[PDB]
Each structure stands twice: as structure tokens, then as C-alpha cells.
Amino acid sequence: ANPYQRGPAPTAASVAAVTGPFATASVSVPRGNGFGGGVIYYPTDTSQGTFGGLAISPGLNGTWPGIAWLGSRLASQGFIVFGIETNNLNDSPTSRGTQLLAALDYLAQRSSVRSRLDPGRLAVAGHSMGGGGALDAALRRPSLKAAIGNAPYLPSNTLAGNRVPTLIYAMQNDTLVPPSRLTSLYNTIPATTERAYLEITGAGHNYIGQPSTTLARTMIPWLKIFIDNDTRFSQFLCPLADQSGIRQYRSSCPLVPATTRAL
Ligand SMILES: [Ca+2]
């Protein structure tokens, strides 16, 4: 068996649901330890083992409440999800990256939920400059299992040398972070690094500010495949089982989880 596998066999309905199969709880975290604090969401059921973790950053002038719907929606699929606040509203993309890594370190070493977490199975995500943060974090910490960038503004616009499986969302109508920019970004990812690109039809830059089934139902498979090695979820992306709301999809299917570290 896959020792990291959690939860029942999925369906299209189960990955699209507002709440998944796991009951969840949260705890607030105050400012400190290198970042602005935030909220940790987690499954309360311990009987299937520890869960992997995801830290999520807002963008410039953003706070976690603006995108907080991700917290319980993702956690209830069997993940520990840390939505962060930044030290300052005007923090840079590389700064957001620093703070995502600081949040993951706090999650693993000091948080009240650290006993529920598998500290070897962590990921990063974010919106806009927070997505740039997530990508920059991935470049710095290749042991991360996954990175998800929503309209990610990475100043360099290059992922050369990235080893972390990366999912990028582009908003069709966005001009701050246009699809053309995000196409170029995707195309810098090394051929040996698993990757995907999804353009959302009719979406503006701040589409993610409202709950989105289109986002949730494609993010959840990505996290399951790469954080949990859980190829029960490959059926949602390889091929794309439902193209509702998606203008363009590119990926390196079949999506194969990273090999286990050398003994
Ligand atoms: Ca592949």
C-alpha cells in the first residue's frame, strides 16, 4: 500500500466539493517567527496517520482572509494547510518566499499541530506576488514536494533549475500577470520536472478572491499526486477529465511522483 494515502477513492464530485471527506479544525497563529502568522487548517482524524503540509501566501496588499476559502476546502481532502499573513503588505516576491519557508519551518517544529504533520512532505502556493514567492521558495528548497502558483508574479520569470513539481494558473483576462508571461514561465521549467499550466476562461487577476471549484478541483489532484504520491488522483488530470472553465491545459502527463530519498 501507499503509506501516505488518505481518504476514500475519489470521484469528480469529491474533488469539486466545498468540504471533502475529512472533518477539519483550525488554529490562529499570531505574528512572529519570521512572518505575519496566519491560520492552520487540519484534519482532526489521526487514525490514518500524519498528513503532508501546504503553506499559502497572499499577494501585494493582500491578507489571508481574501483567499482563505482555500484553507478548509483543501485541508478537508487530508492536508495541513497554513494560510499566512506577511510581515508587511508591501513585501516582495522573494520575501514572500522566505516567509512561506519560515511558515513551513514553524509548522513542522513549533506549531500546535506539528504532531499531525509529516515534515518530509511539504508544499508551497500563493497568489500573484505570493505565487512568485512560492516559486522562489521552490527554487531555494528543492526537497519541497509541490509548488502551486496562481497568476504568479516571479520577477525573473524563470524556473530554470527548478526540481519541484509546479502547477501554474493563468487568468485569461489578467494584464498584470498575462498568460503570455505565464506561458514563457512554464516553458522554462526543466523537462525532467513534472509541471502543468491551466488557463482559466474569463478570469480577471483577482478571480481567486472568490471560491472557485475550477481551481479547487484541479489543485486537489496535484497536491494528492505529489505530496502523498497518491496516483488515485491522476485520473483527474491525465487526461483532464472535465475541461469546464479551462481555456488551455498543458502538462507533462503521465504525472509521476518523485522517487524516495536514497537510503
Ligand atoms: Ca511525466
Side-chain angles (χ1 to χ4, degrees):
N2 176 3
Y4 307 132
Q5 186 188 114
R6 307 285 175 265
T11 73
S14 72
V15 302
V18 165
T19 61
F22 286 96
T24 64
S26 69
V27 292
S28 60
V29 180
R31 289 172 75 75
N33 291 294
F35 64 105
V39 184
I40 303 167
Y41 306 80
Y42 60 93
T44 49
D45 187 1
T46 64
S47 71
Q48 293 177 49
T50 53
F51 299 95
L54 176 63
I56 311 182
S57 177
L60 187 68
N61 293 320
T63 63
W64 168 245
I67 60 168
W69 67 269
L70 295 159
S72 63
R73 193 158 179 164
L74 294 183
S76 61
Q77 299 280 339
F79 297 100
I80 295 169
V81 179
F82 195 1
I84 71 163
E85 303 287 10
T86 61
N87 292 143
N88 313 278
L89 286 180
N90 59 359
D91 285 343
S92 74
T94 62
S95 179
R96 290 164 194 287
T98 303
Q99 290 177 72
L100 287 164
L101 298 174
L104 286 180
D105 294 341
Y106 174 82
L107 189 65
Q109 291 170 35
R110 298 180 289 292
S111 75
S112 64
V113 302
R114 59 193 182 284
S115 70
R116 295 166 186 263
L117 181 76
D118 183 337
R121 309 183 297 112
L122 311 172
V124 289
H127 179 226
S128 200
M129 288 197 176
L135 297 176
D136 190 67
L139 293 163
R140 287 194 256 177
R141 184 171 300 182
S143 60
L144 291 171
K145 292 284 170 186
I148 307 176
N150 182 86
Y153 187 70
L154 184 59
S156 73
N157 207 221
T158 174
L159 293 163
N162 182 27
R163 319 200 74 134
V164 180
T166 294
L167 169 58
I168 290 160
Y169 290 97
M171 311 295 118
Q172 178 176 12
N173 294 337
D174 193 340
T175 61
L176 279 181
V177 195
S180 62
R181 189 189 174 87
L182 296 174
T183 290
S184 303
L185 179 64
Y186 174 85
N187 290 335
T188 65
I189 296 167
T192 48
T193 296
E194 296 287 5
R195 52 193 182 287
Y197 173 94
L198 284 168
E199 184 185 3
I200 308 304
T201 304
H205 182 64
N206 288 132
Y207 171 77
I208 195 163
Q210 286 300 315
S212 164
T213 299
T214 305
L215 292 183
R217 77 181 178 78
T218 50
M219 286 176 175
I220 284 159
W222 193 258
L223 293 168
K224 283 280 180 172
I225 296 161
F226 289 107
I227 299 177
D228 296 351
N229 304 157
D230 186 354
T231 55
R232 300 179 304 163
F233 285 79
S234 303
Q235 65 176 292
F236 302 106
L237 299 178
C238 302
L240 184 61
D242 173 6
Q243 313 172 351
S244 286
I246 292 157
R247 192 160 175 293
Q248 185 175 55
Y249 173 46
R250 302 165 64 186
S251 75
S252 58
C253 283
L255 301 168
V256 173
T259 300
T260 179
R261 179 191 200 253
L263 310 174

